[PDB]
Ligand binder design. Structure first.
Ligand SMILES: Nc1ncnc2c1ncn2[C@@H]1O[C@H](COP(=O)(O)OP(=O)(O)OP(O)(O)=S)[C@@H](O)[C@H]1O
Ligand SMILES: Nc1ncnc2c1ncn2[C@@H]1O[C@H](COP(=O)(O)OP(=O)(O)OP(O)(O)=S)[C@@H](O)[C@H]1O
Ligand SMILES: Nc1ncnc2c1ncn2[C@@H]1O[C@H](COP(=O)(O)OP(=O)(O)OP(O)(O)=S)[C@@H](O)[C@H]1O
Ligand SMILES: Nc1ncnc2c1ncn2[C@@H]1O[C@H](COP(=O)(O)OP(=O)(O)O)[C@@H](O)[C@H]1O
Ligand SMILES: [Mg+2]
Ligand SMILES: [Mg+2]
Ligand SMILES: [Mg+2]
Lengths: 325, 29, 322, 316, 345
């Protein structure tokens, strides 16, 4: 059991790089022993969960880590009743602040809510009501992707801590450090393409590098294993699709669509990469608008559960209509 | 009527161009 | 010490405001001993629990409030075991106290199922002369019409800011914090017509920074700024597609915005922008579709591009009409 | 300690029941024939499914009602044990009755029972058919199994028509000497939504509140979205207008109404609107689509604005 | 097609580099949760079989059938036919229309909290092979995600599926995605020549190419077509009547009846044919795919494209309702109105 996204979490708050302002404010809040307000938010892979776990480890220590820290996934537990019963069951246990090592521990238990922005308004209203139920003995920490998804009352009893996305130089630095630590043979171009396919995510990059070490088995990691583990459709397929739609008939469209489907490539990856291609190139505003609206409708239909081949042939019909006119 | 080429000088406005850039404006009132 | 709502909770029929016809009718019924089963429904934080607690402390003393009033709330699961459990056994009993009816305050009565509301309909119709229920709920339409047909309903609406600002002025005169005009405008706009969130936001602004202005409220709450949404709409209406997409995705990853909040603030903005009717219909249909597509849980960049797409078709049509 | 008008003016004979026509005539024939079969009474809630079999039983048994009549609601326990014990016990007692008289065991809300309860109710209805006659008041007759309804008659109750509710309400008004206006009667019809007990309860609520009947006093004690404003919103959506319709929608949204309440009043007004038939059907389809969005969990103001834009887009 | 399936990754005929990646994955420890996907008939079950062969000894090929009894929230005991062994457990949770969450909770609990018998032979984890996870509901996949989170230590899953857009991203992101493409026409012809030459057959290259092009790159269909062509007439010629599946040519005749006449009595006849197709238990997605392909074979003047969009839209409606005949007849009625409009002008 080697979870590299958990193994390479900095357990010390001084080991947290790039966020020393938030580290210093967290250290002041821990030493002040009166912390009613706490919130972490940012893009995934920024290590807000690792930062609050490092704060919990530097305050509670390893002995109280399994006692006064409770982590719950909000997206896994979107039901009302489970987060009513588990939070109350954890909060009702009266554990004093006395530590066997003699360190002064202030008397609160910490609660982590991972992906708390996935809740609805009524779920967060019931959550707030539970916060007002147990605002004394235990303390809470919400982790969300966007702070504007969180309803107002939960922003009243918390202090925000914004996270910048990590710059690609320190992303490549951390990836080469981890590859040197675990003796992983991968070139600089492989690291750059690995951070390209995982757009601003160190969790996805760490899991993809772990899977590359699993699938290569000691070999040098190439571009093919990276572009196949992430499921990335190669740019030759997208260029062939746009060549068929630009100058061709529906026989060519059905040929390239059947080739993509029988190659096993997912339609979600195709709509994402076709959106990425069509939002940057030199088409007209009307053509880009019609194609992107069709891509959004296609991804909605794929989320509903509609058949992918019919959606792809309708999407390629729309792209052919816009391009071949 | 709802689209004015000249700026309105007594209320707020929001600019709106196109691919050629004629720079129309829209009333915020 | 304590939160301001738990400090300054109203305890008198005159201390609750904007419900003067409702409070007058409740006082008229309770002076003549003709009070029916009550169903107070409305938005959160508009004075539903505190009104019936003021009426209970008018009816009963401090000593017999804990005996002839049973309170059930969100901590109690509302299924079919409760209605055949403590509330039936509470309603079907007499008391050694003065000869008056009992009282059951059932918070969040809209979360009961149709079978649970029918069983509660049986309990309500069986015992009337000794028990007067009080069901308080957010949505009237989530309960059955039989339950609406046996208990008298009362609509606890929102508080108009014209009537909301004297209580805010009273709590800013009693508690000395810095008060400006734009801070009060931000309070009465972001609070959305309920006193509970206004007092919570005011206390959080006092405890976090110390002064109450517009930008302090916006930074403490995280609400999207008006100039922020103005910049988003300007980028959608007078920039290129790749330029607008890159600018808005950098603003989303910087400011911490989300596309649902961008959607509702842009929806509030486009009814100020004097569009022609046809492009207004097109924008509203497209934005409602984007809201539903975000509700069903898809990728976010593609829906952002569809929003920019609708506004680019809009800007082409606006310039072509000019 | 005055009784509510729901139970105070409940009819005591079959001649006062205004709901059905053929079924009440069948009950009137059954009250003098004396060979009453086991019956199942189906219909919407609140249409009078248990103030009709009660009147039939009171006209049938008469002075021996208290010994030879068992009403079993869903108010008590609805397990299999109580139906096994109490119904069989009551059917096994003897009552000195005339030739064309039988005991009556009314089972209100007979649809919530399981398959075992009704498959034992088959034998309880078959065996004791000489002594007692069953009367199951069911909300939905499709949930009743086929062998139960094969051996028993099926009686159907419709939803109260607005003319019948008008006749009953004017009878209650003439009985209680209530001053009235026609606009107040229209308002109590609209807030009644076809249910008789809801109509009587709203009428007694506004009589205890304000007294004299007028259309402004009905909506002070009920506070639905006002049908004048909702009808103006539908009229603006049908007359190729989106700005005035959204102005009315924002006026009804800053009064704090939920999307569900506004869209329910939207459909209830659009039922009785005045326009073309195909436009009505397209509007009802769009309103149902938007209500599926709202009940799915999308309850923003933008969804109502999109509904208004789609209604304005259907009419060119 | 079952006698000569390759038992191990070294005996495969196509996709050698993916076999090398998978045997390197087996070659080390901490084998993660797999999500195997692709098109139907590509060889996903063959790859998963070879993975299970490499994961254990030679006893993987032992299989048995159990009829496990599940209990719903309603008191109802429902039998589920599981294909199990002493090293793994293969289940199809899609047979329960609404109780899929209960069976994927209970089988996960009885496979995780019940420890392995002899931990010297197998590893510390045993495999649960879910089959066809795409038609599971969203709350069922959420319960699958919860049970995968709770029991990572002793139960590591392999999810065989196709068209991964029906699968939610919170359960896709936790699993290593392995994509098995359908083999190329040259590789299908090569394995047809191998399966003919190892049983003494004289299949020419032209008939093999016609078999590969006719089967739409489905390898099981392209091998059962070869065996049916052997049985139908042994001396293999280049011009052979390839044995066509009955519902495919019935769909082609259905599209011919659609394009024949645009009258509502023909719509009633085609409703009868669609009802026959529906009652023959084939899914309406395959029906829409075959109908669209056979209508695009008989269309002209760019109208295909509009028809293509139309087909996708009604398939979307078919994924929102429960009675598929309304949506299928809406599609063919709109198509016949559009043809009548196209052929009239
Ligand atoms: N400031 C930092 N210093 C050092 N390592 C960091 C820093 N930020 C992130 N990391 C690394 O990034 C990894 C990912 O951390 P996570 O906490 O999973 O990211 P995240 O923000 O929680 O995204 P989620 O959990 O998917 S919402 C950690 O295990 C660290 O190794
Ligand atoms: N009319 C009012 N006048 C003054 N303060 C009010 C008024 N209504 C609400 N408040 C304040 O807001 C708080 C919330 O009121 P409550 O009635 O307890 O909430 P609610 O109306 O029951 O809505 P819930 O419980 O969230 S569903 C009170 O404790 C007061 O501090
Ligand atoms: N046709 C009618 N004529 C007169 N009063 C009626 C009529 N229909 C209903 N009522 C009144 O409405 C109430 C009838 O309610 P019930 O019959 O108890 O409800 P129900 O329709 O039987 O549905 P159940 O028993 O809950 S399944 C009484 O107050 C009657 O006076
Ligand atoms: N390397 C191979 N050699 C011979 N036959 C193969 C090989 N790979 C796949 N097949 C055949 O292809 C068919 C694919 O069946 P299956 O693996 O069940 O596909 P799916 O799982 O997509 O339904 C099988 O009948 C199998 O016999
Ligand atoms: Mg996280
Ligand atoms: Mg309350
Ligand atoms: Mg009744």
């Amino acid at each position: 059991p080697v979870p590299w996204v958990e193994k390479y979490r900095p357990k010390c708050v001084d080991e947290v790089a790039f966020q020393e302002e938030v580290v210093a404010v967290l250290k002041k809040s821990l030493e002040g022993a009166d912390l009613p307000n706490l919130l972490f938010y940012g893009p995934p892979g920024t290590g807000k969960t690792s930062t609050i776990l490092a704060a919990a480890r530097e305050l509670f220590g390893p002995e109280l880590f399994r006692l006064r820290v409770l982590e719950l996934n909000a997206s896994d537990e979107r039901g009302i009743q489970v987060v009513r019963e588990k939070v109350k069951n954890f909060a009702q246990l009266t554990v004093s602040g006395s530590r066997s090592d003699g360190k002064p521990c202030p008397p609160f238990k910490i609660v982590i809510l991972d992906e708390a922005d996935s809740m609805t308004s009524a779920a967060q209203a019931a959550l707030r009501r539970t916060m007002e139920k147990e605002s004394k003995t235990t303390r809470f920490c919400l982790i969300c992707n966007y702070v504007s998804r969180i309803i107002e009352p939960l922003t009243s009893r918390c202090s925000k801590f914004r996270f910048k996305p990590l710059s690609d130089k320190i992303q490549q630095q951390r990836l080469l450090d981890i590859a040197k630590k675990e003796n992983v043979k991968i070139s600089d171009e492989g690291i750059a393409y690995l951070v390209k396919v995982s757009e601003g995510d160190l969790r996805k990059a760490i899991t993809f590098l772990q899977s590359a070490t699993r699938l290569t088995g000691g070999k040098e990691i190439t571009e093919k294993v990276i572009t196949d583990i992430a499921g990335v459709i190669p740019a030759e397929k997208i260029d062939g699709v746009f060549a068929a739609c630009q100058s061709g008939s529906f026989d060519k469209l059905e040929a390239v669509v059947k080739d993509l489907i029988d190659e096993g490539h997912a339609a979600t990856q195709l709509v994402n990469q076709l959106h990425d291609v069509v939002v940057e190139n030199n088409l007209s505003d009307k053509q880009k608008s019609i194609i992107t609206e069709k891509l959004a409708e296609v991804d909605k239909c794929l989320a509903d559960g509609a058949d992918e081949h019919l959606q792809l042939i309708s999407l390629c019909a729309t792209v052919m209509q816009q391009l071949s006119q | 009527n709802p689209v004015l080429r000249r700026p309105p000088i007594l209320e707020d406005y929001v600019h709106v161009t196109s691919t050629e850039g004629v720079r129309a404006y829209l009333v915020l009132r | 010490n304590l939160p301001w709502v738990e400090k300054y909770r109203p305890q008198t029929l005159n201390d609750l405001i904007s419900h003067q016809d409702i409070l007058s009718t409740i006082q008229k019924f309770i002076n003549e001993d003709r009070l029916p089963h009550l169903l107070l429904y409305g938005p959160p934080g508009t004075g539903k629990t505190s009104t019936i607690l003021a009426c209970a402390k008018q009816l009963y003393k401090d000593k017999e409030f804990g005996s002839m009033v049973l309170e059930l709330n969100a901590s109690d699961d509302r299924g079919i075991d409760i209605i055949r459990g403590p509330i039936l056994s509470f309603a079907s009993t007499r008391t050694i106290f003065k000869k008056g009816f009992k009282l059951v305050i059932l918070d969040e009565a809209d979360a009961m199922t149709q079978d649970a509301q029918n069983a509660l309909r049986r309990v309500i119709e069986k015992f009337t002369e000794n028990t007067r229920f009080c069901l308080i709920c957010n949505y009237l339409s989530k309960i059955i019409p039989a339950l609406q047909s046996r208990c008298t309903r009362f609509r606890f609406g929102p508080l108009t800011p014209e009537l909301m600002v004297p209580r805010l002025e009273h709590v800013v005169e009693e508690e000395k914090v810095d008060i400006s005009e734009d801070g009060m405008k931000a309070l009465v706009t972001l609070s959305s017509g309920d006193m509970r969130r206004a007092l919570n936001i005011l206390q959080s602004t006092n405890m976090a920074f110390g002064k109450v202005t517009e930008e302090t409220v916006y930074t403490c709450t995280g609400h999207p700024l008006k100039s922020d949404i103005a910049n988003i709409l300007d980028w959608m209406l007078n920039q290129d597609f790749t330029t607008a997409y890159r600018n808005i995705t950098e603003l989303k990853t910087l400011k911490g915005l989300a596309l649902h909040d961008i959607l509702t603030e842009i929806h509030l903005f486009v009814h100020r922008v004097d569009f022609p009717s046809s492009v207004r219909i097109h924008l509203l249909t497209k934005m409602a579709d984007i809201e539903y597509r975000l509700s069903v849980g898809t990728n976010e960049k593609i829906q952002l591009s569809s929003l920019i797409a609708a506004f680019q078709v809009t800007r082409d049509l606006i310039v072509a009409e000019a | 300690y005055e009784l509510p008008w729901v139970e105070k003016y409940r009819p005591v004979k079959l001649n006062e029941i205004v709901g059905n026509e053929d079924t009440v005539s069948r009950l009137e024939v059954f009250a003098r024939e004396g060979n009453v079969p086991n019956i199942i009474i189906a219909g919407p809630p609140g249409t009078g499914k248990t103030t009709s079999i009660l009147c039939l039983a009171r006209a049938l048994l008469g002075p021996a009602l208290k010994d030879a009549m068992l009403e079993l609601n869903a108010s008590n326990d609805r397990g299999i044990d109580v139906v096994r014990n109490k119904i069989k016990m009551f059917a096994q007692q003897k009552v000195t009755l005339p030739k064309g008289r039988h005991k009556i065991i009314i089972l209100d809300e007979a649809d919530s029972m399981t398959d075992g309860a009704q498959q034992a109710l088959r034998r309880t209805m078959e065996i004791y058919s000489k002594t007692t006659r069953f009367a199951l008041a069911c909300n939905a007759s499709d949930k009743i199994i086929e062998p139960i309804q094969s051996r028993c008659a099926v009686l159907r109750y419709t939803k109260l028509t607005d003319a019948q509710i008008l006749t009953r309400l004017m009878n209650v008004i003439e009985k209680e000497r209530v001053p009235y206006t026609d606009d107040g009667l229209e308002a109590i019809i609209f807030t009644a939504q076809g249910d008789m007990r809801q109509a009587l309860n709203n009428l007694q609520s506004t009589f205890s509140g304000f007294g004299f009947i007028n259309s402004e006093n009905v909506f002070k004690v009920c506070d639905e979205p006002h049908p004048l404003l909702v009808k103006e919103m539908i009229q603006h959506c049908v007359n190729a207008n989106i700005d005035e319709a959204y102005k009315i929608l924002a006026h009804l949204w800053h009064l704090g109404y939920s999307p569900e309440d506004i869209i329910g009043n939207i459909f209830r007004v659009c039922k009785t609107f005045q326009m073309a038939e195909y436009l009505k059907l397209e509007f009802i389809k769009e309103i149902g689509y938007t209500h599926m969005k709202i009940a799915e969990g999308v309850n923003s103001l933008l969804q109502m604005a999109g509904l208004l834009a789609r209604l304005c887009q259907k009419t060119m | 097609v079952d006698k000569y399936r390759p038992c191990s990754l070294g005996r495969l005929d196509y996709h050698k580099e993916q076999a090398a990646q998978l045997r390197n994955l087996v070659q080390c420890g901490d084998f993660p949760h797999l999500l195997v996907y692709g098109p139907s008939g590509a060889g996903k079950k063959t790859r998963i079989m070879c993975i299970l062969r490499e994961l254990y000894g030679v006893g993987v090929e032992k299989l048995r059938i159990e009829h496990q009894t599940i209990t719903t929230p309603s008191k109802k005991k429902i039998e589920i036919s599981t294909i199990a062994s002493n090293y793994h457990l293969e289940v199809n949770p899609s047979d329960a229309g609404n109780s899929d969450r209960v069976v994927i909770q209970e089988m996960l609990k009885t496979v995780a909290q019940s420890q392995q018998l002899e931990t010297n032979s197998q590893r510390d984890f045993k495999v649960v092979l879910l089959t066809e996870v795409d038609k599971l509901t969203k709350d069922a996949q959420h319960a699958l995600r919860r049970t995968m989170e709770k029991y990572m230590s002793t139960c590591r899953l392999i999810l065989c599926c196709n068209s991964t857009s029906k699968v939610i991203p919170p359960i896709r992101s936790r699993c290593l995605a392995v994509r098995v493409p359908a083999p190329s026409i040259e590789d299908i012809c090569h394995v047809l020549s191998t399966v003919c030459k190892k049983e003494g057959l004289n299949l020419p290259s032209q008939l093999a190419h016609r078999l590969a092009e006719k089967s739409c790159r489905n390898l099981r269909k392209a091998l059962l077509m070869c065996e049916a062509c052997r049985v139908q007439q042994y001396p293999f010629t280049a011009d052979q009547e390839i044995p066509e599946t009955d519902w495919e040519v019935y769909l082609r005749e259905t599209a011919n009846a659609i394009v024949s006449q645009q009258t509502p009595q023909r719509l009633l006849e085609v409703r009868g044919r669609l009802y026959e197709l529906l009652t023959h238990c084939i899914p309406p997605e395959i029906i829409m795919k075959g109908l669209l392909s056979e209508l695009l074979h008989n269309c002209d003047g760019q109208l295909k494209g509009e028809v293509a969009q139309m087909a996708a839209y009604y398939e979307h409606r078919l994924q929102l309702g429960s009675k598929a005949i309304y949506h299928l007849e809406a599609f063919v009625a709109k198509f016949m109105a559009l043809y009548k409009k196209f052929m009239e002008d």
